[PDB]
Design a protein around this motif. Structure first.
Motif, mmCIF file in Angstrom:
data_model
loop_
_atom_site.group_PDB
_atom_site.id
_atom_site.type_symbol
_atom_site.label_atom_id
_atom_site.label_comp_id
_atom_site.label_asym_id
_atom_site.label_seq_id
_atom_site.Cartn_x
_atom_site.Cartn_y
_atom_site.Cartn_z
ATOM 1 N N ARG A 132 -13.764 -27.780 -10.136
ATOM 2 C CA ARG A 132 -14.045 -28.408 -11.430
ATOM 3 C C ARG A 132 -14.741 -27.412 -12.340
ATOM 4 O O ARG A 132 -15.837 -26.933 -12.044
ATOM 5 N N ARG B 203 -16.362 -26.785 -15.991
ATOM 6 C CA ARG B 203 -16.942 -27.542 -17.093
ATOM 7 C C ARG B 203 -16.579 -26.878 -18.398
ATOM 8 O O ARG B 203 -15.925 -25.833 -18.420
ATOM 9 N N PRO B 204 -16.967 -27.499 -19.516
ATOM 10 C CA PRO B 204 -16.666 -26.925 -20.824
ATOM 11 C C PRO B 204 -17.836 -26.044 -21.225
ATOM 12 O O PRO B 204 -18.867 -26.054 -20.555
ATOM 13 N N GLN C 255 -23.056 -22.367 -8.511
ATOM 14 C CA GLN C 255 -24.331 -21.854 -9.044
ATOM 15 C C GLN C 255 -24.903 -22.856 -10.036
ATOM 16 O O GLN C 255 -24.188 -23.733 -10.514
ATOM 17 N N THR C 256 -26.184 -22.704 -10.359
ATOM 18 C CA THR C 256 -26.848 -23.577 -11.333
ATOM 19 C C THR C 256 -26.145 -23.444 -12.685
ATOM 20 O O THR C 256 -25.587 -22.391 -13.001
ATOM 21 N N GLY C 257 -26.188 -24.504 -13.482
ATOM 22 C CA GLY C 257 -25.546 -24.467 -14.779
ATOM 23 C C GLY C 257 -24.030 -24.516 -14.746
ATOM 24 O O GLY C 257 -23.399 -24.170 -15.737
ATOM 25 N N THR C 258 -23.431 -24.926 -13.624
ATOM 26 C CA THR C 258 -21.974 -25.020 -13.562
ATOM 27 C C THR C 258 -21.475 -26.455 -13.596
ATOM 28 O O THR C 258 -20.363 -26.695 -14.032
ATOM 29 N N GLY C 259 -22.279 -27.416 -13.145
ATOM 30 C CA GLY C 259 -21.823 -28.793 -13.189
ATOM 31 C C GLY C 259 -22.008 -29.694 -11.983
ATOM 32 O O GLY C 259 -21.430 -30.780 -11.924
ATOM 33 N N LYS C 260 -22.800 -29.266 -11.008
ATOM 34 C CA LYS C 260 -23.036 -30.097 -9.830
ATOM 35 C C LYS C 260 -23.858 -31.347 -10.198
ATOM 36 O O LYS C 260 -23.508 -32.487 -9.853
ATOM 37 N N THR C 261 -24.976 -31.131 -10.871
ATOM 38 C CA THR C 261 -25.817 -32.252 -11.270
ATOM 39 C C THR C 261 -24.991 -33.209 -12.126
ATOM 40 O O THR C 261 -24.957 -34.403 -11.875
ATOM 41 N N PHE C 262 -24.298 -32.694 -13.122
ATOM 42 C CA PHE C 262 -23.477 -33.556 -13.955
ATOM 43 C C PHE C 262 -22.477 -34.353 -13.092
ATOM 44 O O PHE C 262 -22.323 -35.566 -13.257
ATOM 45 N N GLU D 84 -24.669 -38.927 -16.434
ATOM 46 C CA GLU D 84 -25.515 -39.511 -17.474
ATOM 47 C C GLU D 84 -25.346 -41.021 -17.471
ATOM 48 O O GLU D 84 -24.234 -41.550 -17.373
HETATM 49 N N1 LIG Z 1 -17.899 -31.431 -17.296
HETATM 50 C C1 LIG Z 1 -18.879 -31.656 -18.168
HETATM 51 N N2 LIG Z 1 -18.658 -32.276 -19.334
HETATM 52 C C2 LIG Z 1 -19.689 -32.320 -20.280
HETATM 53 N N3 LIG Z 1 -20.905 -31.709 -19.951
HETATM 54 C C3 LIG Z 1 -21.048 -31.109 -18.765
HETATM 55 C C4 LIG Z 1 -20.050 -31.092 -17.881
HETATM 56 N N4 LIG Z 1 -20.465 -30.443 -16.801
HETATM 57 C C5 LIG Z 1 -21.709 -30.026 -17.017
HETATM 58 N N5 LIG Z 1 -22.061 -30.425 -18.236
HETATM 59 C C6 LIG Z 1 -23.344 -30.105 -18.897
HETATM 60 O O1 LIG Z 1 -23.992 -28.979 -18.279
HETATM 61 C C7 LIG Z 1 -25.390 -29.296 -18.177
HETATM 62 C C8 LIG Z 1 -25.631 -29.820 -16.760
HETATM 63 O O2 LIG Z 1 -25.267 -28.807 -15.817
HETATM 64 P P1 LIG Z 1 -25.555 -29.067 -14.257
HETATM 65 O O3 LIG Z 1 -24.675 -30.158 -13.783
HETATM 66 O O4 LIG Z 1 -27.018 -29.193 -14.065
HETATM 67 O O5 LIG Z 1 -25.095 -27.708 -13.529
HETATM 68 P P2 LIG Z 1 -25.631 -27.405 -12.039
HETATM 69 O O6 LIG Z 1 -25.035 -28.474 -11.207
HETATM 70 O O7 LIG Z 1 -25.111 -26.053 -11.738
HETATM 71 O O8 LIG Z 1 -27.104 -27.494 -12.166
HETATM 72 C C9 LIG Z 1 -25.583 -30.432 -19.168
HETATM 73 O O9 LIG Z 1 -25.420 -29.928 -20.503
HETATM 74 C C10 LIG Z 1 -24.351 -31.239 -18.813
HETATM 75 O O10 LIG Z 1 -24.097 -32.182 -19.865
#
Ligand SMILES: Nc1ncnc2c1ncn2[C@@H]1O[C@H](COP(=O)(O)OP(=O)(O)O)[C@@H](O)[C@H]1O
Length: 330
Positions: free
Chosen positions: A9, A11-12, A91-98, A103
């Motif tokens: 996956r 992210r944008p 890695q951090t900032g890629t989209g795992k938490t999201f 939200e």
């Molecule tokens: N696929 C997505 N669509 C919209 N925003 C996303 C998407 N994936 C991640 N983000 C954004 O990226 C940031 C969260 O990243 P995060 O999930 O914490 O990455 P990681 O899992 O590496 O910590 C927020 O701005 C979140 O809204």
């Protein structure tokens, strides 16, 4: 077909990468299930790296589509009383938490399918309360959340006494594939919405860990376990008990438990006997949820920015390694 689903996956671009006028080097094709990275420091147009997976989710992919693909088949097995694990890797900032948390949309209607931005964990609880209640099956749902750093265990949910103490772990005599983590805080969930409190507590605790442990944020794994206790009767007295466990794992990027996990998954994929579960804390803890031909999933999250080239390639390589799928022709 393999019970180990590996998906990528991407992210944008957020907005910060926009300020740094970042640009894309990742090429997603969900139809061919391929993700390609276009390398070139001084600009290259003669070599790009391509990988194939069970699913590729581009930037516009909505939460429910990821969830419907990865989690639904798996939650099915858990409701039948089996143990499964869904991993989120990157890695951090890629989209795992999201992907894992997402939200919230409070003050709104629902159905696990309609929540627009809910993450796997909340939506899973959301579907569980909805599915089993519609079915009229008696059930209970409890959860735990532990952390793994430097091959040591930490309870991220224990209220009192929680400023640094380690959890201990030992195999338990009646499930040779399982272990007992004594003292592990298990919180019962009475309604889907109660999960948000839990995640916040976990997050706060995680915030503290970082002020005590170097690079914790990028070197810790979390296992969020949801146990589902079900029981149906027949107005005759006939009882059917099913206890399912779903582990939602957040894996830190490869920037030990990570090493042993890849060998275990690879081994499960190649059907090699002697899968080394014992060689790491994570694989010991999840051994009984990577049992038979149970269903497993790994979501690899990547950034589309050229600035993360090396990290993306790293994440992709690892996913490719875990389950090698041959690239198609053309
Ligand atoms: N696929 C997505 N669509 C919209 N925003 C996303 C998407 N994936 C991640 N983000 C954004 O990226 C940031 C969260 O990243 P995060 O999930 O914490 O990455 P990681 O899992 O590496 O910590 C927020 O701005 C979140 O809204």
């Amino acid at each position: 077909g393999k019970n180990i689903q590996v998906v990528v996956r991407c992210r944008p671009f957020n907005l910060a990468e926009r300020k740094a006028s970042a640009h894309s080097i990742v090429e997603c094709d969900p139809v061919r299930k391929e993700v390609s990275v276009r390398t070139g420091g001084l600009a290259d147009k003669s070599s790009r790296k391509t990988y194939t997976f069970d699913m590729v989710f581009g930037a516009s992919t909505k939460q429910i589509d990821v969830y419907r693909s990865v989690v639904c088949p798996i939650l099915d097995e858990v409701i039948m009383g089996y143990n499964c694990t869904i991993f989120a890797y990157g890695q951090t900032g890629t989209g795992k938490t999201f992907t894992m948390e997402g939200e919230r949309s409070p003050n709104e209607e629902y159905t696990w399918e309609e929540d627009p931005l809910a993450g796997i964990i909340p939506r899973t609880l959301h579907q569980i309360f909805e599915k089993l209640t519609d079915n009229g099956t008696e059930f209970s749902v409890k959860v735990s959340l532990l952390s793994i750093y430097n091959e040591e265990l930490f309870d991220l949910l224990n209220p009192s006494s929680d400023v640094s103490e380690r959890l201990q772990m030992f195999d338990d005599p009646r499930n040779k594939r399982g272990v007992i983590i004594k003292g592990l805080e298990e919180i019962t969930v009475h309604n889907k919405d109660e999960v948000y409190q839990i995640l916040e507590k976990g997050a706060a605790k995680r915030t503290t860990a970082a002020t005590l442990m170097n690079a914790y944020s990028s070197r810790s794994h979390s296992v969020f376990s949801v146990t589902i206790h079900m029981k149906e009767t027949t107005i005759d007295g006939e009882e059917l008990v099913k206890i399912g466990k779903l582990n939602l794992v957040d894996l830190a990027g490869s920037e030990q438990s990570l090493l042993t996990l890849g060998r275990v998954i690879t081994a499960l994929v190649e059907r090699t006997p002697h899968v080394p579960y014992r060689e790491s804390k994570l694989t010991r803890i999840l051994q009984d949820s990577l049992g038979g031909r149970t269903r497993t999933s790994i979501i690899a999250t990547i950034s589309p920015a050229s600035l993360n080239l090396e990290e993306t390639l790293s994440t992709l390589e690892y996913a490719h390694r875990a389950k090698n799928i041959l690239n198609k022709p053309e």
